[PDB]
Design brief:
The complex is a heterotrimer of chains A (about 90), B (about 90) and C (about 5). Chain A is mainly α and about 90 residues long. Chain A is about 65% helix and about 5% strand. The radius of gyration of chain A is 16 Å and the shape is elongated. Chain B has one domain: Histone, subunit A, CATH 1.10.20.10. By secondary structure, chain B is mainly alpha-helical. Chain C is largely without helices or strands. Classes of the chains: A mainly alpha (about 90), B mainly alpha (about 90), C little secondary structure (about 5). Chains in contact: A-B, B-C. At the A-B interface, helix 1, helix 2, strand 1, helix 3 and strand 2 of A face helix 1, strand 1, helix 2, strand 2 and helix 3 of B. Chain A: This is Histone H2A.6. Chain A: Its main location: nucleus.
């Protein structure tokens, strides 16, 4: 058995995202491609935040991301700040 | 069901030697839930405009273009289009 | 506490 995630080149869980989309009744039905597209978008955004938060961790002389690193990475990024809002610690 | 194991796998791709605290991973998981809901709710509003019973890749893509700031939107669309193309060709 | 531990 080959996962939809594996077929799409993704780490994020296509099947689980498809189930959340169907469960919420955002519409009557969900097409096969929609969860693949959404999984890819969420994976991209996770990668963008983690890249910037991990750079902040390292600049801060740490080897692990803590909440303040995420707060600093996001607050210093115009677009991530707009998308995600302020991180409160 | 959370996204945390998947976040962790992506973390190790972008920063092989950097770890993450429990509370930081909670914040990450909450971002993914928050953006999931924003994009699902916009997809719902678009599908209604179109009198469309199915949310397809077309509605997700438009939702991404409307909800995400411009440069993140452009790159996210590139990534979603790429994944659906890879899925369809598998 | 829990927060401060590694994931």
């Amino acid at each position: 058995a080959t996962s939809r995630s594996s077929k799409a080149g993704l780490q994020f869980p296509v099947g689980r995202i498809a189930r959340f989309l169907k469960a919420g009744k955002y519409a009557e039905r969900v097409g096969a491609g929609a969860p693949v597209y959404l999984a890819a978008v969420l994976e991209y955004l996770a990668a963008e935040v983690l890249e910037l938060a991990g750079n902040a961790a390292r600049d801060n002389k740490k080897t692990r991301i803590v909440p303040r690193h995420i707060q600093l990475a996001v607050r210093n990024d115009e677009e991530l700040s707009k998308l995600l809002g302020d991180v409160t610690i | 069901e959370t996204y945390k194991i998947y976040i962790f796998k992506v973390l190790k791709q972008v920063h092989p030697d950097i770890g993450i605290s429990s509370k930081a991973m909670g914040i990450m998981n909450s971002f993914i839930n928050d953006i999931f809901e924003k994009l699902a709710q916009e997809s719902s509003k678009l599908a209604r405009y179109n009198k469309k019973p199915t949310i397809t890749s077309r509605e997700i893509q438009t939702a991404v273009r409307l909800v995400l700031p411009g440069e993140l939107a452009k790159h996210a669309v590139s990534e979603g289009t790429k994944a659906v193309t890879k899925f369809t060709s598998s | 506490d829990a927060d401060e531990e590694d994931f």
